[PDB]
Write a protein that binds this ligand. Structure first.
Ligand SMILES: CC(=O)Nc1ncc(CN2CCCCC2)s1
Ligand SMILES: CC(=O)Nc1ncc(CN2CCCCC2)s1
Lengths: 461, 461
């Protein structure tokens, strides 16, 4: 059994019924199997873990759990008590049991305990009863695990849940030592790789962590997450993980973008990655191509954009220029991966800085010929980004469009300011006009009190 | 019978089941009665009005309609065919009937036809069969109205749906003349006032439009809408409409912010406005105070923010500094109304521009005393905005917080750049440091390709 699929475990707006049901559908049809319920901002999942779900809240989870059964997806309910739990207090342990009993009754059969993103410091009482932090955690986990009849799928998430989080390091951790020794063998351990958001999950570090936890980990992959508060979006393919990891892991769950529809690629490409070495035994990648996987994903995703007779003298059917595969390929390029822009977007950035760097060449002859030859192709590229923004804003699927609309609006806005600036640079040996940010539309014509103040900031001078 | 409540009729992400059910609950408990279903981006409502709803889409609308019945809210289903309908084609009229029949079968008993935001130009075929645009519309409306058994609640939305939209004007419109004459008397007419987003709906213009349409209109009020693409947010009270309008109107439906939870005030204050002259006969406001209505709203809304034993040596319960009424009063002030900032936010803006205007007074004696006395109180105000941002970002209710989080983040970001700038101005007669936008956090530490480009724009120089 290999757990593969999605963990809804980011900070931000939790997905709704409509979205989650749609996720289960897509997961089923791409042959994935797992959904881990972990919304950091489902108040009763973390913050107020003690509270029972209300009647309305209960009917919803039951429906949610039912749908997962209907689409053959295993629903794992996670709880995160580590913010304010007194481990040594028996009333606490009892409440944790009570909570997980409510969810069992809702129809859930697979559970997880999470101790991620909390501090190491125990309280006084706990420090008397427990040797270390790991000892407190493992004790309560094991107890819960056994109390629930030792379910087939039970997960544990460490506090030291990734390479950079282990004191003093991975292979010599007192915390991970305890976990790998004392935690019952029927329980899975979640791991994210070298870092929270791992650029690569090298096979070496998987063997390294495998040794100390004394089992194969389940990846909680944060490759596509965007909950870090400087809004980005990742539509690139699943990269950085060798298919050789598959036979060395108990599972891979991906914690994708907060915006739901922005996750087609992320989840699609993971399924392709998983299916490429589904059965393979234990032995850059010889089985999986991120470039070819992104293409397959975008090809199928395009079909999600499409539309669901009149006489020559009658009114023409509502229609607009269709979104093309090339449009999407450009979209993904511009909103690629956390550690890597796409080729064309990266190239546009180089070009813009070169043009601005060498703009003296046109201020007051062979460099002049190269500069213009480059500023031409740059404006021609800026034009394509606008082109595909417009086709995107016109498509039939409004749900997909509005999930990433603010991102698309931002880059569209910048490109035009950038295009104007290049034009204005290219015309200064025959123009006396001074460039100002306060002359544009996204800066000088911005709404709200926030904008009124922004215009008064020292822009240009 | 007075129709009062909400129209979901904006451009953007349509609300979901969870949100709409919550709306019905709140509407019921505030003694409102109506919900008009009009999402411009429900693809099968406008764009592809011909298409039947799918089985999945049907179960959802049935549930939605059922919930409205459960909370005693009248569900009105609207359709907008005016983008590509051939009025004269009998196959078209038949499809419009077929569509509205599906929805009737879902349990809906009240309907609306919308012809808002389309051009006046008919096609060739229609121009032969119909005298004018209004003639085409009224013909199809009347037909539908009668075919559905002349329902108790049927609405019509004009193309010339507001003052500024009538050629050549309101009282002398050929379009409105036809509508007021030919449109059956059992049908309501929607009106938004002098403009799309009316600052005021003067009693005079209501009598003016009443005469030509030959009936009392139902207001489709856009006071709180924010779908115009330069993101603002309106948490101010329902203002600009005299309670004298109530006995001169058949209804008021409000088309509020796209962000659902951002609409407590908007809908609350409307209920207060409506209840203040519920029964009153036909005779600045002597019955309703926007200031007192906003206070009542924020007072009750605060209760929506609240949280749903340990020994001295145990772990303290998770807690944080609570959101206060004064916090909300400040929040509403900063995100007030479309034509009006709140007092404190407006005052902060004046102060900032005065300080920047008179910053020479501290560049190289009595003005110096006034400037510092003012720059002090400004920084003290900037500090409060941060203060309440933080309390807000810490509250129990994550759904409310994340609905307006991007707005709150933007203003919070600007305030700090502004605070730094004032500080930097106040210290230049004893400092050699030059101010740069590219030194800050929201400009020089911004994520994504969009940011990389933004840093290369001519900021400061
Ligand atoms: C165990 C584990 O990985 N927990 C997580 N919670 C949320 C995540 C995504 N995001 C990454 C960037 C920083 C904020 C959080 S990762
Ligand atoms: C008849 C009527 O008012 N229709 C509407 N559709 C949407 C509305 C809100 N918003 C106002 C500002 C411009 C964009 C649209 S108003």
């Amino acid at each position: 059994r290999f757990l593969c699929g999605v963990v809804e475990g980011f900070y931000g707006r939790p997905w709704v019924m409509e979205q989650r049901k749609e996720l289960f559908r897509r997961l089923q049809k791409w042959e994935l199997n797992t959904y881990l319920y972990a919304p950091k901002d489902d108040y009763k999942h973390r913050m107020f873990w003690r509270e029972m779900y209300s009647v309305e809240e209960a009917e919803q989870l039951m429906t949610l759990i039912s749908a997962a059964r209907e689409y053959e997806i295993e629903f794992i309910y996670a709880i995160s008590p580590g913010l304010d739990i007194t481990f040594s207090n028996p009333k606490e342990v009892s409440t944790l049991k009570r909570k997980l009993d409510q969810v069992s009754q809702f129809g859930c059969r697979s559970f997880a305990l999470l101790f991620d993103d909390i501090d190491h410091n125990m309280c006084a009482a706990d420090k008397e009863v427990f040797s270390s932090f790991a000892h407190a955690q493992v004790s309560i986990t094991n107890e819960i695990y056994q109390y629930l009849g030792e379910p087939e799928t039970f997960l544990f998430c460490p506090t030291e849940y990734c390479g950079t989080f282990c004191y003093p390091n991975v292979s010599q951790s007192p915390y991970l030592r305890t976990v790998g020794e004392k935690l019952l063998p029927g329980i899975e351990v979640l791991w994210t790789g070298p870092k929270v958001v791992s650029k690569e999950i090298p096979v070496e570090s998987i063997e390294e962590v495998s040794k100390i936890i004394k089992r194969a980990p389940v990846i909680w992959d944060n490759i596509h997450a965007n909950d870090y508060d400087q809004k980005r979006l990742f539509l690139g393919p699943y990269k950085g993980r060798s298919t050789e990891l598959i036979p060395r892991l108990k599972g891979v769950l991906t914690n994708p973008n907060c915006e739901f529809e922005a996750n087609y690629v992320a989840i699609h490409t993971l399924a392709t990655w998983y299916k490429s070495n589904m059965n393979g035994v234990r032995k850059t990648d010889v089985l999986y191509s991120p470039q070819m996987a992104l293409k397959l994903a975008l090809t199928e995703w395009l079909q999600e954009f499409g539309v669901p007779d009149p006489g020559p003298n009658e009114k023409p059917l509502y229609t607009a220029e269709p979104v093309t595969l090339e449009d999407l390929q450009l979209l993904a390029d511009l909103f690629y991966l956390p550690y890597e822009h796409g080729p064309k977007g990266a190239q546009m950035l180089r070009e813009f800085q070169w043009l601005r760097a060498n703009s003296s060449v046109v201020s007051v002859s062979e460099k002049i010929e190269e500069w213009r030859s480059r500023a031409a192709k740059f404006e021609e590229m800026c034009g394509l980004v606008m082109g595909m923004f417009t086709r995107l804003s016109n498509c039939a699927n409004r749900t997909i469009l509005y999930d990433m609309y603010s991102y698309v609006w931002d880059i569209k806005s910048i490109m035009s300011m950038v295009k104007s600036f290049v034009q204005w640079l290219g015309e200064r040996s025959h123009s006396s006009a001074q460039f100002l940010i306060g002359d544009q539309e996204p800066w000088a014509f911005r709404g709200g009190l926030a904008g009124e103040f922004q215009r008064l900031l020292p822009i240009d001078g």
